[PDB]
Amino acid sequence: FHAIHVSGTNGTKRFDNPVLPFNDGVYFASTEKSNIIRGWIFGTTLDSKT
Amino acid sequence: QTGKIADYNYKLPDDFTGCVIAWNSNNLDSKVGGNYNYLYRLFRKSNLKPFERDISTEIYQAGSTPCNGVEGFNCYFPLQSYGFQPTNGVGYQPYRVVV
Amino acid sequence: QVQLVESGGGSVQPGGSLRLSCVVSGYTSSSRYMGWFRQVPGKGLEWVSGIKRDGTNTYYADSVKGRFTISQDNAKNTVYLQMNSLKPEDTAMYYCAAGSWYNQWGYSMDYWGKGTQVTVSSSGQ
Amino acid sequence: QVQLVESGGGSVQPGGSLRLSCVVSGYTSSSRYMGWFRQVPGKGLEWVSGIKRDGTNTYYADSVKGRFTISQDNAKNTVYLQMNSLKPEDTAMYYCAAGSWYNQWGYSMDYWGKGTQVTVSSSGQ
Amino acid sequence: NCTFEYVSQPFLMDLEGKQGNFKNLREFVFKNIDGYFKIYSKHTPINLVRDLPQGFSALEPLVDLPIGINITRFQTLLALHRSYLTPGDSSSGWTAGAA
Numbered sequence: 443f444h445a446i447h448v449s450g451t452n453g454t455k456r457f458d459n460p461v462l463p464f465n466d467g468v469y470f471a472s473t474e475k476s477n478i479i480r481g482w483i484f485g486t487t488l489d490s491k492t
Numbered sequence: 493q494t495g496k497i498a499d500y501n502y503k504l505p506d507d508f509t510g511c512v513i514a515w516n517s518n519n520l521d522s523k524v525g526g527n528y529n530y531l532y533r534l535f536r537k538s539n540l541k542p543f544e545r546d547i548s549t550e551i552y553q554a555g556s557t558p559c560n561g562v563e564g565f566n567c568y569f570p571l572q573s574y575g576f577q578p579t580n581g582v583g584y585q586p587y588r589v590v591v
Numbered sequence: 592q593v594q595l596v597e598s599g600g601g602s603v604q605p606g607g608s609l610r611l612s613c614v615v616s617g618y619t620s621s622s623r624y625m626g627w628f629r630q631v632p633g634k635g636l637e638w639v640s641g642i643k644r645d646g647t648n649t650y651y652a653d654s655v656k657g658r659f660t661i662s663q664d665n666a667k668n669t670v671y672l673q674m675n676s677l678k679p680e681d682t683a684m685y686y687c688a689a690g691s692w693y694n695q696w697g698y699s700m701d702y703w704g705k706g707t708q709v710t711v712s713s714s715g716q
Numbered sequence: 717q718v719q720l721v722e723s724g725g726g727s728v729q730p731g732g733s734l735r736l737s738c739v740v741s742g743y744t745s746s747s748r749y750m751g752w753f754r755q756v757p758g759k760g761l762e763w764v765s766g767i768k769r770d771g772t773n774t775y776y777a778d779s780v781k782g783r784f785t786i787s788q789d790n791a792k793n794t795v796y797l798q799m800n801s802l803k804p805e806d807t808a809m810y811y812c813a814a815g816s817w818y819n820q821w822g823y824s825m826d827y828w829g830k831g832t833q834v835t836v837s838s839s840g841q
Numbered sequence: 842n843c844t845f846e847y848v849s850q851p852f853l854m855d856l857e858g859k860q861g862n863f864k865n866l867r868e869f870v871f872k873n874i875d876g877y878f879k880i881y882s883k884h885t886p887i888n889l890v891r892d893l894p895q896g897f898s899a900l901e902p903l904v905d906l907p908i909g910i911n912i913t914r915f916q917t918l919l920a921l922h923r924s925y926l927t928p929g930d931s932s933s934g935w936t937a938g939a940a
Contacts, residue, residue, distance in 0.1 A: 443917075445919055445937050445938065445939065445940040446937070446938075446939045446940075447936050447937035447938060447939065448939060457919065457921075457937050459916060459917060459918075459919055460916070461914055461915070461916045462914065462915060462916065463913065463914055464871075464873070464912055464913050464914055464915050466872075467870065467871060467872040467873070468870070468871045468872075468915065469868065469869075469870055470868070470869045470870075470871065470917075471866060471867070471868045471869075471892070471893060472866070472867045472868075472869075472940070473863035473864075473865070473866050473867075473892040473940065474856075474863065474865070474938075474939075474940030475856060475858075475859075475860075475861055475862075475863065475864050475865075475939075475940075476856075476938050476939075476940060477853065477854060477856075477920060478919050478920055478921075478937065478938050478940040479853070479867075479917065479918075479919065479940060480853065480918045480919065480920050481853075481917075481918045482871075482915055482916065482917055482918065483915060483916050483918065484871075484873075484910075484912045484914070484915040485910070485911075485912060485913075485914060485915070486910075486911045486912065486913045486914060488914065488916075492910070492911065
């Protein structure tokens with residue numbers, strides 16, 4: 443998944459904050475010269491009922 | 493173990509390592525007019541996993557009547573309140589448990 | 592020991608509205624369930640609606656979805672049944688019963704009341 | 717699956733005697749532990765006594781020494797509490813509980829009985 | 842209505858150098874077992890585009906939180922520039938970096 447704004451003026455606005463399955467566990471890697479990645483949220487039905 | 497508490501409220505893993513302590517609290521948890529302030533889960537679609545908490549209050553469909561919403565038949569509020577009358581038999585009195 | 596007293600019956604043109612209320616007196620509460628029933632002359636009782644005190648396990652008969660609307664007033668120990676758009680079929684002799692719907696065990700309509708009547712007609716009662 | 721049956725309580729003058737019997741039914745046993753607990757109104761449960769299926773490292777509270785005696789009969793699956801020198805505070809609700817007292821692990825009080833009352837008074841119950 | 846709050850010294854900010862394409866590869870392993878939320882992680886300084894090199898890294902445990910929830914779905918949080926004062930295309934919206 444990318445978080446790359448910069449483009450060639452044809453199509454900008456490329457990022458990714460999708461809601462993904464957890465299954466049995468997760469491996470999460472991050473590459474960044476900045477602090478864009480800040481954390482995570484976990485749940486089942488992320489509204490107010492759980 | 494198996495039962496309402498061991499299935500829908502609080503479950504210990506088969507490989508548990510620790511101590512269960514329990515003592516009667518009829519003198520601090522039951523009132524003449526009835527202490528209805530303690531609740532337990534009575535219906536649930538599946539058993540809990542060990543050390544898994546559930547504080548949901550969604551309506552449980554007990555029968556075959558699709559009942560999205562408060563209205564509906566055989567659709568119950570999942571929680572139920574203990575009727576800790578001080579006149580209850582010790583078997584039904586409150587019991588404080590620390591694990 | 593316990594008494595149920597109804598009120599609010601009468602007649603109304605088809606497509607009208609009405610309000611049947613009734614009060615209980617003599618039940619120690621806990622898990623009151625108060626339920627409205629109808630009797631069509633020549634047939635047994637048919638569940639109209641029901642409700643528990645603050646348990647809100649409300650019931651509405653299938654054919655009457657929307658026509659009725661049940662409500663409570665626990666301080667006054669009363670239950671209200673609003674009705675809107677009375678079709679001609681709704682004419683019947685109405686009652687409300689008191690019981691206890693424990694979730695783990697089941698419902699029993701211990702006591703029944705006197706009753707009121709609902710007449711859907713073009714010329715009144 | 718199990719039942720505990722209590723009997724033998726009542727009222728007696730101070731300095732009298734009694735005997736409370738609790739019958740057990742429904743255990744595979746192995747490590748039965750039958751005990752009596754005392755409920756003083758306005759308080760909680762207190763230990764009175766306890767005994768195993770032949771283990772006999774009995775328990776008696778600090779203020780209860782001497783007066784009370786514990787006996788068992790595995791053939792009848794019963795346990796008895798002999799009551800002597802009833803000093804007034806011994807007026808309370810006695811309950812027999814059953815569980816397992818393991819040396820290595822500890823104890824649990826799995827089941828409780830119906831219970832019976834004892835009145836140390838000058839005029840009876 | 843919530844049950845567990847926790848704070849600690851941070852671990853996210855360990856950046857190296859200034860002007861590499863992608864410099865610091867931070868790996869985390871999340872594992873929810875028996876009401877226990879285990880978080881492992883380790884950081885490696887590596888400079889490359891289109892990362893995940895072919896090396897070997899042993900991930901060390903950071904924390905094990907006793908949460909006791911179900912967890913079947915998750916999402917990542919990104920700090921996003923708000924484009925209503927920035928020099929670039931600042932009318933109402935937002936801008937992001939390159940991570």
